[PDB]
Every structure is written in C-alpha cells, then in structure tokens.
Design a protein around this ligand. Structure first.
Ligand SMILES: [Ca+2]
Ligand SMILES: [Ca+2]
Ligand SMILES: [Cl-]
Ligand SMILES: [Cl-]
Ligand SMILES: [Cl-]
Lengths: 98, 88
C-alpha cells in the first residue's frame, strides 16, 4: 500500500495525480466552478488558493494570478472571457442554499 | 509564477494540493461519488485510478484497493458500508 512506498515516489505520485486533475478539468471546461462549489464545496479557484498555501509551506512565492494561470492553463481573465457563463438564478439560489 | 519556482518546490506544492483535496473530500463525506461524476466527470475512485497510473510512472506498485484505502482514508469496503447511499 501507500505506507510501503518511499516518500520521494509518493510525493511524485501525489503531484502527478494533481496535474492529472488539472488536465481533467481543462478537458471539461463545460464543468462550471459554481456547480463544483454547490456539489463539492471546491472549484478551480480553490485549487489555486491551495497551491498558494503550499507555496508558503515551501518558502516560495506564488500570488493568486500566478496560481490561477497555472490551474486554468492561461490567465484567469482570458479563461473567463472565452469560457465562463455567469450563474443562473437557480445556481445562485442553490449556492446560497449551501 | 509557477514556471519560476524550482522543480522540487513545484512538485511538493502539487503534491500538497492533492493531499488538501483528499482532506477536503474526506471532510465532505456527504458529497457522493455519483454527484461528483454528474457535475465534474470524476470522483474519489478516479483519484485512486490516477494514483495507480502515477505509481507505474514511478516504478512502484500501488494496486486499486491500496489506492482507494489511501484516497478514502480507510478500506473502500468499510467506506461503502458507512457512507455510501443508493442513488436517488
Ligand atoms: Ca491545465
Ligand atoms: Ca483521508
Ligand atoms: Cl466556471
Ligand atoms: Cl469563477
Ligand atoms: Cl459515494
């Protein structure tokens, strides 16, 4: 199991799995952040925030724009223009519900 | 940005963010795998499969039950009996 694997390999595997998640989300641009928030309490923006937190743990610098640019594969502003639809009344309500 | 960070730190950050997502999902055991499949096209089993694929990349064995035990924080059988509900 995981307990049996050397730390360096485990870190590489967890890193690889994270990058896989980024590709998956990039391949499903129809999957909206507000729906991720409603269903699962996280979205692409949270992954960017979590990277910034990890940057602090590693003594390195990453700001939110840089983190988002990495997560989205381009500047957030461009992603928003090209791909994002604003929330529906039902999504706002359902977000307000949770 | 991310391209400016040394490779070892960047790897550590990606791994940390993956472990954060695991803790997040463990904190939301209410969030069923079906809803994740519906809304996001992946679920906890997917994360475990991706970890299996990453193990192969690293020249180590991690089988599916091993991967799921890690992702879920306990054997999947036990998780299914305690947390999984039939789909409405
Ligand atoms: Ca990407
Ligand atoms: Ca866990
Ligand atoms: Cl979105
Ligand atoms: Cl957003
Ligand atoms: Cl489930």
């Amino acid at each position: 199991g995981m307990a049996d694997i050397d730390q360096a390999s485990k870190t590489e595997m967890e890193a690889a799995a994270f990058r896989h998640l980024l590709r998956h989300l990039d391949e499903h641009k129809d999957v909206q952040n507000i729906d991720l928030m409603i269903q699962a309490d996280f979205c692409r923006n949270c992954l960017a925030k979590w990277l910034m937190e990890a940057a602090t743990e590693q003594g390195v610098e990453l700001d939110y724009d840089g983190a988002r640019e990495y997560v989205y594969g381009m500047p957030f502003a461009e992603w928003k223009t090209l791909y994002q639809k604003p929330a529906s009344e039902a999504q706002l309500a359902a977000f307000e519900a949770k």
